[PDB]
Amino acid sequence: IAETLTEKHTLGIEKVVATDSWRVGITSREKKLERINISAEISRRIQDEAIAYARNKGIPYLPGINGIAWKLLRLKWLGYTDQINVVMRTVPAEWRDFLTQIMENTQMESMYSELRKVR
Amino acid sequence: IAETLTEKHTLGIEKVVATDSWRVGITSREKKLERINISAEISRRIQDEAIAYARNKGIPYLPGINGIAWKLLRLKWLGYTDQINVVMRTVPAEWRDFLTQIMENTQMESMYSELRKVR
Amino acid sequence: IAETLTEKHTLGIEKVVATDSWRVGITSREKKLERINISAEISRRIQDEAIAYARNKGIPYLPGINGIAWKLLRLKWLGYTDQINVVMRTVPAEWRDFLTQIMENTQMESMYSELRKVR
Amino acid sequence: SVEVYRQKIEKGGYSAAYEATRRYEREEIEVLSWSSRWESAWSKFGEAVKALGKIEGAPRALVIAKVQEALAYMSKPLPNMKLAMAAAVQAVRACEQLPGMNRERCLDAVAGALGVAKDWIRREMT
Amino acid sequence: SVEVYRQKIEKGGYSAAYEATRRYEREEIEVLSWSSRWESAWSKFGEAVKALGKIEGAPRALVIAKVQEALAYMSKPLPNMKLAMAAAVQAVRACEQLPGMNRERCLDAVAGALGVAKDWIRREMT
DNA sequence: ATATATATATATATATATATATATATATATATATATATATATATATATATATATATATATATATATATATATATATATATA
DNA sequence: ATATATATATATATATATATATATATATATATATATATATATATATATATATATATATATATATATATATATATATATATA
Incomplete structure (x- = not known):
């Protein structure tokens, strides 16, 4: 009946919940998921150096300087x-x-x- | 039908009570939970010195000076x-x-x- | 439908009798409960002094002077x-x-x- | 960590949010009473944090947070303007360091957001 | 890898997408409200990319991506034009190395797509 | 031996449909692998804060319920001397 | 006179569940600001490779089912000399 871009986004979601492609999209990879481990480490490493920088110079800790x-x-x-x-x-x-x-x-x-x- | 910020907060709750993400959100962490142990230890140490400070100087114990x-x-x-x-x-x-x-x-x-x- | 302080007090009581948080709130502490033992001792220690005080000076025993x-x-x-x-x-x-x-x-x-x- | 990530995946939040969405469109879900208590109370914090739009530059999360902390004390059943100014002078000092902002321009944005006079924050600055 | 390929094939996506289309034509599926929130927000990014049509030559993906990144910063509830010009000058430098393009003709395409003046990007270029 | 229909076996070719194998490409769908980015949704990890919920831990108090302990007395019921 | 359960006066300590004031920390689920990384599903931009199903161009092999031409053999059922 219709094929516009609002309804192409819907009919893609409808086939995903039908065939269960989201959870088998994650569990079949199982190799890229350790990138979450390495990203969790650098976020901890940058944030600790941001706090120690704030105490050696006496400036207050400026939040969001981790993401910058x-x-x-x-x-x-x-x-x-x-x-x-x-x-x-x-x-x-x-x-x-x-x-x-x-x-x-x-x-x-x-x-x-x-x-x-x-x- | 609609998507405003009141009923976005509602529909986020309905997906939590459906799949039980609150209790599995607590029991899967189980490393951050020992912060509750350390926080109860500090608050005991602050309260005990607050009452000793009240009796050393003869002032009444002022409640809520722990939180400050x-x-x-x-x-x-x-x-x-x-x-x-x-x-x-x-x-x-x-x-x-x-x-x-x-x-x-x-x-x-x-x-x-x-x-x-x-x- | 409504959220006033009368029925906020009710809906907190309804969630207690539903999941039985009262009887697990007492039995899980098991360390705070020895305060009842020590309060029982000072109540007995004060009351016995009150009757000895009433008998040494010949004055009648005054109930509630142990509570004061x-x-x-x-x-x-x-x-x-x-x-x-x-x-x-x-x-x-x-x-x-x-x-x-x-x-x-x-x-x-x-x-x-x-x-x-x-x- | 990956293992804490996996246990929320097996609970199936994608399909469960999709079915709860379709239930709303077929009128099987009404607005929860927690949400009406939320939007009645939060709404002053949403439009007052948008009044910090003309602050430019760096991470402005520290000016955003301490202005939101300052509104929390004035909104108590027993309001405390003394502790509310304590968070306000921190937001002024945090706004001052940004490239392009002045002390008087940060006294403009902060006091206009809280809706108070400028001289109250300047008194605690010293 | 083939082992990640095979597990999506056995889920049967070709047949399931055919039945999802037939259910739509028999009016048993309405438009999800996730799509109404998507098309209301994305549509400003769709026509801005089409406004870079007169750039010719190389892989133009870096010009398209840095314009989309620069437009997204202006669309925040608290917009940051400082970080938006940071992503904009990367698009101008990436455009001017292509065969056929000038510095001003890439300043024409970028500032016309973002809808700002040309002098705002020229100041940050140095 | 002829003719109508049903089957097999030799050949050269056309056309409709169903399949295989060689190649260069376009288009519609279904998947995979490289990259830079936007938006919608589902989760993780860093930070500063507000709000709605449930949940611990310090404190001073009021109120409604459920229990313990020390006293003086009344009343209703239950037992003893 | 004494023990228990209930309601009520006075004078109190202690434990719990609930609501409320004031001064806080920590962990969870939800919504919102700012500054970010990573994985997935969806739609879209740019530059591509590989596998499948469909449709179409060009230039061809091969095996089936059907219809048609030409030149035949063999088996069956029917009608005829």
Whole structure:
């Protein structure tokens, strides 16, 4: 009767709950699921360095600086460097040294984990 | 039929009581639950020094001074210090020395336990 | 349909008798229950002093003077001394010496029993 | 962790949310009474956190949180404007560090969001 | 891998999608409310990508993705034009290396798609 | 030996339909594997907070229920001396 | 006089379930702000590979069922010399 993009999205969902392709989509992979493990580790590693940075300089802990430092880690891997340069102007002054601490100064532990996760 | 924010909160509850995600949300974690043990330990340590402070100086025990001293313990950890400065003017005179006793004079016992709990 | 404080009190009671949270609320504590044992001891210790006080001075035994002297024992423990002074004016004259007997002269036996109960 | 992830997957939240959605369209589910208590109380926190739109720059979660913490004290049955200012002067200091924002422009956005005078927050600043 | 391929084949998706279509034509399936929330939100991203039609040459996926990322920042309840221009200047640099494109002609396509002035992106370019 | 129908076996070819195997491509559906991104939904992991629920842990108190302990007395019932 | 269960006066401590005030921490499910990563299902952009089912182009092998041409043999049922 009809085929528009609102109803193509619906009829795709209808076949998913019919044949149960969501839960067999996850349980049949079982190899990509350890990327959740590695992502859980880098989130813990970045956040601990964000708190220790806040106590050595006496600045309050600025929440959401974990996610900013994690985006810049992933773009440094790809090569979007002028993406980085505008965000470094956007964060405040005392936290710019922390963001380059995650990229360059923790290139040993943290960049190897993203090099292991996308592999 | 409709999708507003009142009935989005409802339909999220109906999927919880259908598949029982609350109780399996607790029992699958079972590592974060020992934070309840450490939090009950700190609150006992704060309450016991509060009553001893009341009898050493002859002031009546002021209830709710546990919660004020426990909030300032966690903000000292993050670094919200002008949060502290307004609160220290808000409590009465003879209890200000107790509030800085939890923060720095019983730092080592109490700040380690928050350093252990959030870890 | 409605959410006022009368039927909020009801629907909390309905969820208690449904899942039996009262009888599992008592039996799961099993450590707080020894406070009933210690409260039984101080009630017996105060009442026996009250009849000995009535027999040494020849005054009739006054019921409820054991309950009054138990409140002054606990307010002394907190530090609410201005509440102590008004009840001392309220009790009759021959029984004022008994009320300071419980707080001071048998402090060592009775204030320790409160000090072990709240812990 | 993966193992805590798996145990919520086997409960089947995708199909269960789909069946509860279809039940709503066939009028088998009404609005729960918890939701009406939620939207009556939360709605002041939604439109007042959108009044922080003209703050630009960095992660603004700290200005967003302490403004929401400041509205919590004024909305008590016994309101405490003394402790509410304690969270407000933290939001002002957090707003000040951002590139492009001023101290007076952050006194504009914070006090306009809470709906109070500017001089109340400036008194506690010192 | 084939072992991840086979487990979706034995679930029978070809027959099940045929019966889902026939149920729709016999009016036993109505439009899900997830789709009404989808098409109301996505439709601004659909016509913005079609506005990059006059860019020619290479794999244009980086120009399309960074424009979609820059549009999404402006659509928040608290929009951030600072981080939006961060994703926008990556699209301009990725566009100007293609054979046939200039710096201003990529400044034409990006600022026309996002619907902003050309000088906002030129300031961040440096 | 002829003709109508039903079958087998030799060959060269056409057409309709059902299948296999070679190739280059388009389109509609069903799946897989690479990439950058958006949106809807289902889950995980970091943080700061508000709100609705249930759930522990500190405290001072009121009220409604359920129990314990110390006293003085009344009343209804149940037992003893 | 004494023990128990119930209701009621006065003077109290203690344990639980519920609602309510004030000052808090921790874990869970739901909705919302900001700053993010990872896995899945769906729809869409860009640049592709491989497998299947369908339809269509080009240029062909091979095996079936049907209809038709030409040149035959053999078995059956029917009608005829």
